Amino acid sequence: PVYVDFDVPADLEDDALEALEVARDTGAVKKGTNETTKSIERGSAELVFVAEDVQPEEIVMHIPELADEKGVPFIFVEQQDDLGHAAGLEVGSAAAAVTDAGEADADVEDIADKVEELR
RNA sequence: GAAGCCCUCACGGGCAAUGUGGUGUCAGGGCUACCUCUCAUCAGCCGACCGUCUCGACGAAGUCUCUUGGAACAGAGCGUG
Numbered sequence: 001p002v003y004v005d006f007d008v009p010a011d012l013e014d015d016a017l018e019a020l021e022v023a024r025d026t027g028a029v030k031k032g033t034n035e036t037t038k039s040i041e042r043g044s045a046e047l048v049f050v051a052e053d054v055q056p057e058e059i060v061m062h063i064p065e066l067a068d069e070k071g072v073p074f075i076f077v078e079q080q081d082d083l084g085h086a087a088g089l090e091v092g093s094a095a096a097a098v099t100d101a102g103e104a105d106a107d108v109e110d111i112a113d114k115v116e117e118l119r
Numbered sequence: 120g121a122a123g124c125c126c127u128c129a130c131g132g133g134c135a136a137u138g139u140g141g142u143g144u145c146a147g148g149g150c151u152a153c154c155u156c157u158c159a160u161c162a163g164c165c166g167a168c169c170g171u172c173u174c175g176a177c178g179a180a181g182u183c184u185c186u187u188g189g190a191a192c193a194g195a196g197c198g199u200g
């Protein structure tokens with residue numbers, strides 16, 4: 001919330017998770033706020049996901065600004081266990097990063113586009 | 120970066136990406152490229168001697184004479200470990 005500056009429509013979110021699912025099956029993705037963070041710092045990230053129901057908020061407060069000063073696109077997901085499920089985890093995930101998609105690049109690209117537009 | 124842990128004989132359940140587990144800890148460490156090598160450390164297995172404290176077994180040689188005395192464990196005499 002304090003780190004959320006725009007609401008992502010349920011639909012856009014639907015597509016993103018799908019792109020992430022096919023991303024892990026095809027391309028490469030990182031699970032966990034620590035791995036996600038290093039990807040953004042190493043620049044090996046194309047699209048980063050960040051849950052909104054993370055408590056405490058400190059765990060992910062840094063993602064937004066760290067991404068902007070890295071050109072890396074990011075998007076918000078409502079639930080925390082969905083991001084984890086979509087990332088292929090048996091638990092939750094406060095953040096995720098698509099480290100080079102796979103057969104989803106087109107979509108991942110559009111999702112990012114739709115985001116910049118959503119300001 | 121799930122390669123992990125806990126419960127249950129098992130089935131199975133729970134924990135764990137808000138990080139279980141590997142690596143590492145100033146002889147700094149990690150990483151990339153090499154040399155060599157390990158007996159350091161850490162984990163686990165086995166597992167005492169001796170010493171000390173207490174407890175217990177075994178364990179030598181007179182119950183001889185006289186006198187006194189209620190009693191010899193006394194005095195004098197002879198004998199023993």
Ligand SMILES: [Sr+2]
Nearest residue numbers: 081091092093
């Ligand atoms: Sr959870």
